[PDB]
Write an enzyme that holds these catalytic residues in place. Structure first.
Site, short mmCIF file in Angstrom:
data_model
loop_
_atom_site.label_atom_id
_atom_site.label_comp_id
_atom_site.label_asym_id
_atom_site.label_seq_id
_atom_site.Cartn_x
_atom_site.Cartn_y
_atom_site.Cartn_z
N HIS A 1 0.82 -1.21 0.00
CA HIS A 1 0.00 0.00 0.00
C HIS A 1 0.86 1.27 0.00
O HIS A 1 1.11 1.84 1.03
CB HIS A 1 -0.88 -0.04 1.26
CG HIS A 1 -1.99 0.94 1.25
ND1 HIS A 1 -3.00 0.93 2.19
CD2 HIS A 1 -2.22 2.01 0.46
CE1 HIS A 1 -3.81 1.94 1.95
NE2 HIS A 1 -3.37 2.58 0.89
N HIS B 1 1.52 5.19 -1.87
CA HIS B 1 1.17 6.29 -2.78
C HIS B 1 2.43 6.95 -3.23
O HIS B 1 3.12 7.60 -2.44
CB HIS B 1 0.33 7.31 -2.05
CG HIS B 1 -0.98 6.78 -1.61
ND1 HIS B 1 -2.07 6.70 -2.46
CD2 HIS B 1 -1.34 6.19 -0.46
CE1 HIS B 1 -3.08 6.13 -1.82
NE2 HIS B 1 -2.66 5.82 -0.60
N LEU B 2 2.76 6.76 -4.50
CA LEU B 2 3.98 7.31 -5.06
C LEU B 2 3.78 8.69 -5.70
O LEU B 2 4.77 9.32 -6.01
CB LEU B 2 4.55 6.36 -6.10
CG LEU B 2 5.23 5.13 -5.49
CD1 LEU B 2 5.65 4.25 -6.56
CD2 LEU B 2 6.38 5.42 -4.54
N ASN C 1 -4.60 6.06 -7.46
CA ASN C 1 -5.17 7.39 -7.40
C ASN C 1 -4.14 8.48 -7.78
O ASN C 1 -4.06 9.52 -7.15
CB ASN C 1 -5.75 7.68 -6.04
CG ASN C 1 -4.73 7.72 -4.99
OD1 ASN C 1 -3.68 7.05 -5.12
ND2 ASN C 1 -4.97 8.52 -3.92
N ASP D 1 -9.30 3.12 -4.34
CA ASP D 1 -8.55 3.78 -3.25
C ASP D 1 -8.49 5.25 -3.32
O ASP D 1 -7.98 5.81 -4.28
CB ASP D 1 -7.07 3.29 -3.17
CG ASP D 1 -6.31 3.82 -1.92
OD1 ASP D 1 -6.67 4.87 -1.34
OD2 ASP D 1 -5.32 3.24 -1.42
N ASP E 1 0.88 2.21 3.97
CA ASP E 1 0.03 3.29 3.51
C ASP E 1 0.86 4.59 3.48
O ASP E 1 0.40 5.67 3.91
CB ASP E 1 -1.21 3.47 4.40
CG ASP E 1 -2.15 4.55 3.84
OD1 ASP E 1 -2.07 4.87 2.63
OD2 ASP E 1 -3.00 5.16 4.54
N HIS F 1 2.51 13.97 1.97
CA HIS F 1 1.77 15.24 2.00
C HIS F 1 2.74 16.34 2.41
O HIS F 1 3.66 16.16 3.24
CB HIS F 1 0.64 15.23 3.05
CG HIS F 1 -0.50 14.32 2.71
ND1 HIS F 1 -1.36 14.56 1.64
CD2 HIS F 1 -0.96 13.20 3.32
CE1 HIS F 1 -2.26 13.59 1.58
NE2 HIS F 1 -2.04 12.75 2.58
N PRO G 1 -4.30 11.72 9.68
CA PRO G 1 -3.71 12.22 8.44
C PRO G 1 -2.89 11.05 7.86
O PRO G 1 -2.46 10.12 8.60
CB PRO G 1 -2.83 13.38 8.90
CG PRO G 1 -3.18 13.61 10.37
CD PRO G 1 -3.60 12.26 10.86
N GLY G 2 -2.77 11.04 6.54
CA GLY G 2 -1.85 10.13 5.89
C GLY G 2 -0.45 10.51 6.30
O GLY G 2 -0.15 11.69 6.49
ZN LIG Z 1 -4.27 4.48 0.20
#
Ligand SMILES: [Zn+2]
Length: 363
Positions: free
Chosen positions: A62, A64-65, A96, A154, A255, A259, A263-264
């Site tokens: 999981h 996010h690149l 996404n 996602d 995950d 950012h 929060p992520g």
């Molecule tokens: Zn995700």
């Protein structure tokens, strides 16, 4: 050119084979050749892994690149560097991006970028619906043939049960999982649809005791449902911790969510020391920790990784469970810094990461 590498003096743990102990590993021409107490062969490079744990390369399912679309936050290069510094030899990127991963052009872009970076393997996922708009199902067969290993919308849960049911049917036909995710109802819906379709659903977010009990219910009935937790978030936190102890949670997944302004948080580089805190507090065994980073995620996405079997690609992580360090400007490889671990003392550090027999990271 060097043809052979011996990883000597390490504590080898390969749960897929129920193998553990003080063993050397001989890698020849990129593949695992022999595992034995004491190995010495001529014209080999030698890594001295005394006092280190040697295990299959970690797999992060999981991440996010942010590439394409928000490359100032992270890109395939910087995310790949974070990943190998964290011990990961294989990462799965979420769809996404902008544009989203819903056609073969975007899949090709990510695969070509990853090949040009040459550090960890990046496996793309596709969206469930065109544009992630939630209405019209994507072309799973073409996306899978191009390289996607799973499908998810996602960012935004699939809302319509009829869309989810169609996706799981198509997924069951192709042998790939659907990744998903009020929470409790959605997890129940997914388990019910997984049972009826024979599809495999992977639950990305679990935050309550009832959620874990529902998942465990479905697993006991033989439904193909798996789930993950972010070790960085563990430090309902206590309920999650019990879920890990009992084996309800299949794998750790970062995950990693860059950012710059839930929060992520970024996570690839801190996944291991975070997970090792659970080990030091007696919540999981070391073997279970390694399972949750290797063979379990490998099985969830259906790839022949996460092992040290003879003939396998030599993807190996070597770490010191007791080495103190700090994530800061001297060590951070991400383009973002968004983690509550910034600047704190961590314990446990990857020392070497080896992919296809080549050292891709060294502390
Ligand atoms: Zn995700």
């Amino acid at each position: 050119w060097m043809l052979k590498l011996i990883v000597k003096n390490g504590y080898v743990i390969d749960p897929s084979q129920n193998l553990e102990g003080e063993f050397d590993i001989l890698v020849e021409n990129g593949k695992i050749k022999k595992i034995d107490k004491n190995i010495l062969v001529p014209e080999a490079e030698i890594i001295d892994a005394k006092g280190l744990i040697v295990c299959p390369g970690f797999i992060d399912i999981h991440v996010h690149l942010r590439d394409p679309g928000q490359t100032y936050k992270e890109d395939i290069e910087s995310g790949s560097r974070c990943a190998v510094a964290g011990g990961f030899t294989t990462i799965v990127c979420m769809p996404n991006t902008n544009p989203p991963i819903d056609n073969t052009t975007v899949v090709n872009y990510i695969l070509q970028k990853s090949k040009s970076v040459g550090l960890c393997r990046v496996l793309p996922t596709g969206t469930i619906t065109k544009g992630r708009k939630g209405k019209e199902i994507a072309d799973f067969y073409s996306l899978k043939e191009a390289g996607c290993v799973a499908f998810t919308d996602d960012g935004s849960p699939v809302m319509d049960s009829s869309v989810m049911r169609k996706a799981l049917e198509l997924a069951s036909q192709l042998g790939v999982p659907i990744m998903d995710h009020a929470e409790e109802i959605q997890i129940a819906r997914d388990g019910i649809l997984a049972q009826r379709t024979g599809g495999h659903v992977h639950i990305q977010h679990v935050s309550t005791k009832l959620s874990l009990e529902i998942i465990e219910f479905f697993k006991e009935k033989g439904v193909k449902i798996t789930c993950e937790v972010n070790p960085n978030h563990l430090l309902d936190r206590l309920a999650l911790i019990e879920g890990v102890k009992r084996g309800i949670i299949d794998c750790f997944a970062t995950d990693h969510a860059p950012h710059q302004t839930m929060p992520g948080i970024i996570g690839l580089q801190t996944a291991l020391p975070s997970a090792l805190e659970l080990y030091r507090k007696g919540i999981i065994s070391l073997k279970k920790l390694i399972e949750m980073f290797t063979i379990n995620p490998a099985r969830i996405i259906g790839v022949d990784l996460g092992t040290l079997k003879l003939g396998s690609p030599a993807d190996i992580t070597i770490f010191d469970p007791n080495k103190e360090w700090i994530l800061n400007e001297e060590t951070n490889l991400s383009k973002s810094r968004n983690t509550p671990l910034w600047g704190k003392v961590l314990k446990g550090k990857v020392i070497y990461t080896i992919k296809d027999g080549k050292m891709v990271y060294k502390d």
